[PDB]
Amino acid sequence: FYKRECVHIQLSPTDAFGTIEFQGGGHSNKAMYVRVSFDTKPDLLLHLMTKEWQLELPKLLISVHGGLQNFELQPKLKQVFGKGLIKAAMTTGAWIFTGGVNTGVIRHVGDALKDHASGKICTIGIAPWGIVENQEDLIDVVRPYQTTVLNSMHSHFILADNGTT
């Protein structure tokens, strides 16, 4: 139903709409994956997240924006940052919007989440379709997607059809 309802790009129909499990590291970290177009239908995404993926509406919502450049993180700042973010997310049971690209601040965020995971925080990674390491691999069926590749920790992935990278 999603493929017919959602069309991902001049213009291209449907495509993608297949979850991939990142069985590269210690944790497989099964997650959803859908490649939406640049234009988005709020109702479609809301229904897909709430109903198709069976995710309860959170009492809190967080949107995080950071630079794509990869830089070292200060130890003292990161120690407090990761713990506080994990505690707040667990207490609120809230969705976290983050970039789907591993490179950049997201990387540290995902690592921090991983170090604080082992709550089943329902994150949402949104990254350009072009940034995907192996766009053709996804092609709806489980995909190995050996571990630029997207972060494995984030779940409920969405992507935009930006054409050329």
Partner 1 sequence: EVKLRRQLEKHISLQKIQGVPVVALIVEGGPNVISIVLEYLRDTPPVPVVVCDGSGRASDILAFGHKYSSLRDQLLVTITQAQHLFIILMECMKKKELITVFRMGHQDIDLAILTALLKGANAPDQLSLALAWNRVDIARSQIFIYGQQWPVGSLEQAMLDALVLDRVDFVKLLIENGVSMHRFLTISRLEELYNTRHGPSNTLYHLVRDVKKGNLPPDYRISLIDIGLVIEYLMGGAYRCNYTRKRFRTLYHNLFINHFPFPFHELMVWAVLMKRQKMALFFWQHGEEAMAKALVACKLCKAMAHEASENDMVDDISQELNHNSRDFGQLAVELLDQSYKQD
Give whichever of 26 and 42 is closer to partner 1, judged by the CB atom: 26
> Which pairing describes strands 124-128 and 95-99: parallel, antiparallel, or unpaired?
parallel
Shortest distance (Å) from residue 88 CB to partner 1: 28
CA distance 36 to 21: 19
Confirm if 2 and 15 have CB atoms less than 8 A apart: no
Shortest distance (Å) from residue 116 CB to partner 1: 17
Shortest distance (Å) from residue 151 CB to partner 1: 14
CA distance 67 to 79: 20
Residues that bind partner 1 (CB under 8 A): 23-26, 146-147
CA distance 156 to 88: 20
> Which pairing describes strands 61-63 and 95-99: parallel, antiparallel, or unpaired?
parallel
Give whichever of 23 and 135 is closer to partner 1, judged by the CB atom: 23
Confirm if 19 and 33 have CB atoms less than 8 A apart: yes
Give whichever of 63 and 146 is closer to partner 1, judged by the CB atom: 146
Give whichever of 101 and 158 is closer to partner 1, judged by the CB atom: 101
Shortest distance (Å) from residue 147 CB to partner 1: 6
